[PDB]
Structure 1
Amino acid sequence: MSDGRESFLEVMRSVYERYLVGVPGVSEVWLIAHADSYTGLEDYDGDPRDPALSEKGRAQARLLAARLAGVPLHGVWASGAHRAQQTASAVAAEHGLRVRTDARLREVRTNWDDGRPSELKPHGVYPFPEPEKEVAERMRTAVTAAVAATPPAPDGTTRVAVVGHDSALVILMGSLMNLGWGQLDMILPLTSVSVLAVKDERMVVRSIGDATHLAAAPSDVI
C-alpha cells in the first residue's frame, strides 16, 4: 500500500513514457536489413553493385517473411536496390501490401560504389566516402516520410516495415542515440529486424539487430 510500491510504479511509468511506451499515437517502424546477395558474387554476371538475392538470401527472406506473417503491418518500404526490393517483396506478399520505394533508403556510398578498392579500417574509423551525418539525415527523413505516407491503422499500433541496408541502418540507430560511428559497436545481420517507436518527429530505438528467425536454420542459410 504505502510501502514504496506507488513511487516505484509512478517513476517506472515516467521512464517508460520517455521511450514512448504507454504513450498514445505511437507508430512502430520495423527496420529490416536486406537478405544475402553476396554469396556467389565473385562469379556473378549481372550488375555486381546491384545484385539480386543469392540462393541463401532467398532462404533467409522466406524465414523472415514467415516470422512477420502474423505481425499486423500497414506498409512495406524499400530502397531502390534489387536486394532490398526482393526482401521487401517476400515480406509484403504475406500481408496484401505493395512494396513502396524510397531511393533515400539506399546504402551508404562505399569505396566499391566509387570504383575504388575496399580497405579494412581499424575499429571506430569511419570507412565510407559519404559522411555519417548525411547518411543519418537521409535515413531519418526517409523513415519519418514513410510514416507520414502511412494512414494511421484503425486498430492498435500502426506498423511500417522498412527494408534497407545494414550500414545505413546502424548509422541511423546510433545517431538517434547521439552516438557516432563505432560507439554503438554492432553489425546488423542480414534479414535482422530492429524496431523504432515514432511519434510526430521523435524517433526512439526500441530493439536492434534481431535475426532470431535464423536460429534453427542450417549453416548454409546463416
Structure 2
Amino acid sequence: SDGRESFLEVMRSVYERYLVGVPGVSEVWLIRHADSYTGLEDYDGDPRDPALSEKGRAQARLLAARLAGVPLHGVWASGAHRAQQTASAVAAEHGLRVRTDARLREVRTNWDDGRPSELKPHGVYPFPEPEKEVAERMRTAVTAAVAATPPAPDGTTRVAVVGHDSALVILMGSLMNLGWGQLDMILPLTSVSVLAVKDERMVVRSIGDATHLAAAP
C-alpha cells in the first residue's frame, strides 16, 4: 500500500460515525412550514395561528413537487394551521394522512405572552420558553415519529416532520451539543433539514435547504 488503504479505511470509519453507508438508518426530513405572514397585517383570522398565504400555498406546491419522487413513510406536523396545511400538500402525494403532535409547536414567544417582540443581539436567547425545554420536547416528538413509522421494505425509511423555525433550530443545535446562537441560522420557509437516525444515535445530516424556491420569483 502507498497510503491509499489507510486513507480508505479512515474514510469508511468517519462515514460510519455519521451514519453514512450504515444499514438500518432511518431519516427524518424536518420541514419548516410555508409562508403565513404575507398579508398578516390585514388578516381577519387568528394572527398567531394563520392559514398559509397565497405565497405560502405556492411555496408548499413547490415543496410537494420536490418531494413527489422521494419515498416517505409518515408525515407528522404540529397543530398549527400553517404546519398542517404545508404537511397536507406533501402527504397527499404519498398516500398518507397527516398526523399531529403538538410537541412540535413553535417555541413560546413574547407575542404569546402579550409582550412586544424584541430584536435581540446575536447570541441572546429571545424567547420565554427555555431552550432546554424546547430541545427536550422536540427530541421526544421526533423520536416518537420515528418509532411510529414501520420500517419500509424498500430503501431508507423516511418520516417527514413539519414544524417551526426556532424549535427546529434548537433541536438541531441540541443534537450537536450547541446552544442558541452557535448554529447561527434561520431556516427558510419550506426548507428541508435531514436527520439520520439509528437506535440512540441521531445525526444532523443537512440543514435549511430551500433550493426548490430558486427557480420561482
TM-score bracket relative to the smaller structure = over 0.9
Instruction: Give the alignment's TM-score, normalised by structure 1.
Output: 0.97
Distance in 1, matches of 2:166 and 2:208, equals: 12
Distance in 2, matches of 1:201 and 1:10, equals: 25
Distance in 2, matches of 1:180 and 1:125, equals: 10
> Is residue 79–residue 106 contact of structure 1 (8 Å, CA) maintained in 2?
yes
Offset at 1:202?
1.6
- SS of equivalent residue, structure 2 residue 85: helix
> Is residue 144–residue 201 contact of structure 1 (8 Å, CA) maintained in 2?
no
> Is residue 192–residue 211 contact of structure 1 (8 Å, CA) maintained in 2?
yes
1:19-50 CA distance string (max 9 Å, x none)? 01111111000000000001111111111110
1:86-113 CA distance string (max 9 Å, x none)? 0000001111111010000000000011
Q: Which moved more, 1:115-124 or 1:102-111?
A: 115-124
1:31-70 CA distance string (max 9 Å, x none)? 0000000111111111111000000000000000000000
- SS of equivalent residue, structure 1 residue 145: helix
- SS of equivalent residue, structure 2 residue 128: coil
**Unaligned 5+ residue runs, structure 2?**
none
Distance in 1, matches of 2:185 and 2:92, equals: 30
- SS of equivalent residue, structure 1 residue 11: helix
Distance in 2, matches of 1:72 and 1:5, equals: 36
1:148-180 CA distance string (max 9 Å, x none)? 000000111000000000110011001111111
The residue that corresponds to 1:200 in the other structure is 199
| TM alignment of 1:179-190, pairs within 5 A | 179-190=178-189
Runs of 4+ in 1 over 4 A off after TM superposition: none
Matched residue count: 217
- SS of equivalent residue, structure 2 residue 137: helix
- SS of equivalent residue, structure 2 residue 111: coil
1:161-210 CA distance string (max 9 Å, x none)? 00000110011001111111000111000000000000112210000000
Percentage identity across paired residues of the two chains: 100
The residue that corresponds to 1:139 in the other structure is 138
**Unaligned 5+ residue runs, structure 1?**
none
Instruction: Give the alignment's TM-score, normalised by structure 2.
Output: 0.99
Distance in 1, matches of 2:206 and 2:101, equals: 23
| TM alignment of 1:203-218, pairs within 5 A | 203-218=202-217
> Is residue 135–residue 171 contact of structure 1 (8 Å, CA) maintained in 2?
yes
